[PDB]
C-alpha cells in the first residue's frame, strides 16, 4: 500500500556508456521495478510531464544542477517530485516490505552484474 496517487515516471535517458547486454539488464531491472511500483498502486507513466511525482533515473542525480532547463530531471527538481535511483528505489520497495525476487519467474540475482568486480576479486 503506497501513497493514494503516486505517478511514476522512469527516465529513458543515460549518462553512462554500456554495452548492449549491460543495457539489456538495466530495462529488466527497470522492468522488475515496475511491477515491485505497480503493486504498491503506483500509476507508472509513459511521458514525462508536471502530474509526474517521482522520477526513477540511471543518471546522476548528484550533478543533475549541471543539466539544461529543458531536462526532465531538472524539471523535476525544480518542481519537487523525489528522484531515485535505481538502488534507491529499490531499497524503497523492500522498505515496504515488497519481495522483489517473488515478482520475477527469473532468478532476481541474474540482474547483478559481477563480472568485472569477480575479475577482480579473483585478481586479488
Same mark, same amino acid.
Given at each position: 500500500?503506497?501513497?493514494?496517487?503516486?505517478?511514476?515516471?522512469?527516465?529513458?535517458?543515460?549518462?553512462?556508456?554500456?554495452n548492449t547486454y549491460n543495457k539489456?539488464?538495466?530495462?529488466?531491472?527497470?522492468?522488475?521495478?515496475?511491477?515491485?511500483?505497480?503493486?504498491?498502486?503506483?500509476?507508472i507513466t509513459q511521458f514525462f510531464?508536471?502530474?509526474?511525482?517521482?522520477?526513477?533515473?540511471?543518471?546522476?542525480?548528484?550533478?543533475?544542477?549541471?543539466?539544461?532547463?529543458?531536462?526532465? !530531471?531538472?524539471?523535476?527538481?525544480?518542481?519537487?517530485? *523525489?528522484?531515485? =535511483?535505481?538502488?534507491? @528505489? %529499490?531499497?524503497? $520497495?523492500? /522498505? !515496504?516490505?515488497?519481495?522483489?525476487?517473488?515478482?520475477? *519467474?527469473?532468478? =532476481?540475482?541474474?540482474? @547483478? %552484474?559481477?563480472? $568485472?568486480? /569477480? !575479475?577482480?576479486?579473483?585478481?586479488?
Open positions: 500500500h503506497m501513497k493514494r496517487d503516486s505517478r511514476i515516471y522512469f527516465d529513458i535517458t543515460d549518462d553512462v556508456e554500456m539489456s539488464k538495466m530495462d529488466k531491472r527497470r522492468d522488475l521495478l515496475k511491477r515491485g511500483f505497480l503493486t504498491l498502486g503506483a500509476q510531464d508536471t502530474t509526474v511525482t517521482i522520477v526513477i533515473t540511471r543518471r546522476s542525480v548528484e550533478n543533475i544542477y549541471l543539466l539544461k532547463d529543458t531536462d526532465i !530531471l531538472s524539471r523535476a527538481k525544480k518542481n519537487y517530485m *523525489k528522484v531515485w =535511483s535505481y538502488e534507491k @528505489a %529499490a531499497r524503497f $520497495l523492500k /522498505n !515496504l516490505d515488497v519481495d522483489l525476487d517473488h515478482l520475477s *519467474k527469473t532468478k =532476481s540475482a541474474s540482474l @547483478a %552484474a559481477p563480472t $568485472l568486480s /569477480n !575479475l577482480l576479486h579473483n585478481e586479488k
